[model samples]
Target: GAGLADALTAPLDHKDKGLQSLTLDQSVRKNEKLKLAAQGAEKTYGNGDSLNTGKLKNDKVSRFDFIRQIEVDGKLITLESGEFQVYKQSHSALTALQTEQVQDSMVAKRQFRIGDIAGEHTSFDKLPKGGSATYRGTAFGSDDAGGKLTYTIDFAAKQGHGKIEHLKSPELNVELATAELKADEKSHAVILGDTRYGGEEKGTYHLALFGDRAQEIAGSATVKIREKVHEIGIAGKQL
Candidate 1:
């Protein structure tokens, strides 16, 4: 009953058919059309009631890894990992963000999750070796900060770069710079780093090559410029 209407609200189900799976050509846009799935595990608390309130981010600096703490409403949450399975092509699975400490009153150990999650498994061995590929796409962030994103990747050197410009943010004026790219054969992902866009404008990007010939490029990005931080997602197709 809920499948057709609220389908996008949940991750792709195993039995469901027809709907296309999400690939991290990072599913940023399609995620809007797709249901945002959420599931959680909460434990009963002990003794008296505990009332608290606050929110925060992790203190550790990350240039590659994306895992971090999630502090919400005074409760502390940490990351946990399991199931190292390589997806066959596209299937849904769950990932977790759980509580770390003896969270007193309400919940002792809670697991916040989102899944039925689908990831399009791409084969790195199938990438092209004949020549470099160019990808053209759009970088969108709240409409106002949207702009053009152009990228070029050379398979032989296993390296490439992207340029995001003409971003039209009225007050936020997002200036995404040139982000250097390097491929990781083992992980089947590409890292976007050293955004020479310079100064306080630093960015972190991670993308995966999609399709048999690496014809699709997609990923999310975090742009840190001065006092503001902008998170963006984009999908590019080979030209």
Candidate 2:
């Protein structure tokens, strides 16, 4: 008996106006809030699970993964990511006793990776003309002896890929005893430094990327360094 329409003049029953739409909006908003809350919680409690963690690092080095693999004297140490540091040290107290066989080993090395440039990118700055890109970086070449080098890739200040600037260079040669090559336009810089033995050395082959303009390209964003060396034994091989 109550199946009749609302009063025609009753301001359209104030409660029925877009009720379904309002409910949907509230549900969507609630979901969004929940997602944000979860993200915030993760940021606060999560250890970031950084790839550089000691655990995963050791795991990958011990057990080869994907991206890139590493080997020390034909022994596979790692095969996961790029860039690694390996070093060794000796103590004074143990020097007088049975000599500890501190062998030359892979210090630390990272897999050299190439980045991709996209169309929708631009540089907010410029690679100063004749200005050399900072190349103060180093890496290990072999499992035994390692070295350090610092160099910069010089380039012509120019913008590209829209409003982006690139001082692209691959081989960052040595200055005093120059490495005999020239830098190019590849957004990379070479480093120069002293080898482990420090006696007229060719040094290891390593590259690094930096600068405000260089980083704006597309797939380049990291300021890595390796000074300490940690050994990651192969999983199949006993330590």
Candidate 3:
């Protein structure tokens, strides 16, 4: 194939400079080969001493005449030709879009808040004395490119009518308050947890379970607290 001259590496002041010169030398050689190929020539541009350079079959008409060329850093660099360029551009755009989609999937899986999972109720019967009611919720955000999902919930009681506690699992008797919650802190019933999914994928929701127990007074008369209702507040966030 017809190609261009392969520059000999110049001696440098230091070892690092010598390594850097090799990179530059390789880039220059690539440019030479690209230039020749653009001109419908096929030549070996690097030195092996055994290699040969000759005229290509279609020298009269450049194969890349339909392609665009521009001078870059004193070297001629050819751009892709018409349909080929369009295809390349389209492929690159699609690749970028797919990458974003993958990221979105991961992000969504790990991210969500309490409100996204649970809803409030209107009417409810009071639990019997020393009885409790349980509430559960799960939330997740849309997928993202990649990463882990972590979350925190800020659960509080509007009125001190009942005690709110988080459950670790339905089958298990574990309470989130004893396991994951940050105790010794007042003002809220906060707990933290996380999950790992398909390589930081998106839109996966998380879960939190809670139980409400009516407050009981020991050895006291069961005074009818009329219209007995429990009100609880929930707030959640991602970390």
The number of the candidate with the highest TM-score is 1
Task: Write candidate 1's Cα lDDT for 1-239 as tens digits.
Answer: 22222222334444554214333322112212211221221211112211010010111100111123234576745332211111111122111122223335423443322212223434666666657888876554532224666778877766777766656753222333444444465545454653445445455665666665666666555565575656555456688
lDDT for model 1 = 0.41
Candidate 3 accuracy as lDDT: 0.20
Report how far off residue 76 is in candidate 1 (Å).
16
Candidate 3 lDDT, 1-239, residue by residue in tens: 32222211222233221011111121123333322224333332231121111211111111221222455788855442221000011001000001111123123222111111121111113222232323222111112111111222322321111111332221111112212322213222223322112222111122222123211110000111133211112222221
Sort order, TM-score high to low: 1, 2, 3
> Residue by residue across 1-239, what tens digits does model 2's lDDT show?
11011211113333432111101121112212111111112110111211111111111111111222234676643223322221111100000001112123523333232211112111223434454433322222223112233333444432111110111221222222233222335534322222221233323322222233442111111212244322111001001
Residue 58 miss distance in model 2 (angstroms): 17
Residue 77 error for model 3, in Å? Answer: 36
Worst 10 residues of 3 by lDDT: 86-95
**Comparing candidate 1 with candidate 2, which one achieves the higher lDDT?**
1
lDDT ranking from best to worst?
A: 1, 2, 3
